[PDB]
């Protein structure tokens, strides 16, 4: 019932990492309501207005030499630093998937609880990879530092058929596999 | 490629600020403003790292000053409501008598205010439920998870109700075994 006007200001320091900490790019973004108004890109070393509303801030902040220098140093003092402080429980994090198969006409391969999110999931009917007929849920963040996904296979199975969902993920050396045949 | 975001906000009139760190879309931690302390998204993290919470209070004080300046410069132009997509799902596939977790996923919305209520069998649950803070997105909207542990059964049914100023009426989101 609260219809009062809302006003929002957001500040985001984005640290982008390529090949360990080999290439670091810092991106400070200023957003009013839904409109980013001014940013500092390390690739540039100065603030730039993104829209008119941000012009006064870029011009003004660009005139503070001591602070600008500090921002240019941030790739080392701030990004690379935090990268190291936190890298042993974030980047190195590995949590192994859990796989389950079951009919939903349609076979489902549930793969859940895993981290990181880069994963490979493939179906086989009687030993030959099936690719036509495969639909998926996409990747899904649970917000608790784990992912999940459903990979469906569309088929009508003759009995005595052995479908097999295989999953590959950096957490485990050998591909996980789960078998599923229908009954008469 | 990895991305570590330090994301801060301040919202008026609600007078709420937030300060958190994001790794590839997951919260590393945030600072509880009321308690003036650091809350790690997984307690484990706290074994390896520390973060002076008082730091965030000073940033928030600046963010607030800036919001007021900016509110005026815009000629008191308010944020446009963007209502969330809400979806309900579980930690794992569910088998009766095995403890699972219901997740209420609230996505693509602004401003960062929502009333979220869990219902077991039509009645409001507030014990064991938990939630994340408002998580950042490229398009500068937010997202958020609410969680409810449960013991799956045929006897029981669930809904997640979500209120946001951008919705004509509350979203009810049903789940049952």
């Amino acid at each position: 019932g609260d219809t009062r006007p809302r006003f929002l200001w957001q500040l985001k320091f984005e640290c982008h990492f390529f090949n360990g900490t080999e290439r670091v790019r810092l991106l400070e973004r200023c957003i009013y309501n839904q409109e980013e108004s001014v940013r500092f890109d390390s690739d540039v070393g100065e603030y730039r207005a993104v829209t008119e509303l941000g012009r006064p801030d870029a011009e003004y902040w660009n005139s503070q030499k001591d602070l600008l220098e500090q921002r240019r140093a941030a790739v080392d003092t701030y990004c690379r630093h935090n990268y190291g402080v936190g890298e042993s429980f974030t980047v190195q994090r590995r949590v192994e998937p859990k796989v389950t198969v079951y009919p939903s006409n349609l076979l489902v391969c549930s793969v859940s609880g895993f981290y990181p999110g880069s994963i490979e999931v493939r179906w086989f009917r009687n030993g030959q990879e099936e690719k036509a007929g495969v639909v998926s849920t996409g990747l899904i963040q649970n917000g608790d530092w784990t992912f999940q996904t459903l990979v469906m296979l569309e088929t009508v199975p003759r009995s005595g058929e052995v479908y097999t969902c295989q999953v590959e993920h950096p957490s485990v050396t050998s591909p996980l596999t789960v078998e599923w045949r229908a009954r008469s | 490629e990895h991305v570590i975001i330090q994301a801060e906000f301040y919202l008026n009139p609600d007078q709420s600020g937030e300060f958190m760190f994001d790794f590839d879309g997951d919260e590393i931690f945030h600072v509880d403003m009321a308690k003036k302390e650091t809350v790690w998204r997984l307690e484990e993290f706290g074994r390896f790292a520390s973060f002076e919470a008082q730091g965030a209070l000073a940033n928030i004080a600046v963010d607030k000053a800036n919001l007021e300046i900016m509110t005026k410069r815009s000629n008191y132009t308010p944020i446009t409501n963007v209502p969330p997509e809400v979806t309900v799902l579980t930690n794992s596939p569910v088998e009766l008598r095995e403890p699972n977790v219901l997740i209420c996923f609230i996505d693509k919305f602004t401003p960062p205010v929502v009333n979220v209520t869990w219902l077991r069998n039509g009645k409001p649950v507030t014990t064991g439920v938990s939630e994340t803070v408002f998580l950042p997105r490229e398009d500068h909207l937010f997202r958020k998870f609410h969680y409810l542990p449960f013991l799956p059964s045929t006897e029981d049914v669930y809904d997640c109700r979500v209120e946001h100023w951008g919705l004509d009426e509350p979203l009810l989101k049903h789940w049952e075994f």
């Binding site: 500040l11 320091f13 400070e28 006064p56 801030d57 003004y60 902040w61 503070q64 602070l67 921002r71 941030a74 003092t77 701030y78 630093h81 935090n82 190291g84 402080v85 936190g86 | 330090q6 801060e8 760190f21 590393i28 074994r47 390896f48 790292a49 520390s50 973060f51 002076e52 730091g55 965030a56 000073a58 940033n59 600046v62 963010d63 000053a65 800036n66 300046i69 900016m70």
Partner: peptide
Amino acid sequence: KMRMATPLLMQALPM
């Protein structure tokens, strides 16, 4: 006028 907030640092715990 507008002021710049500070990039903040996590720290390693003595292990």
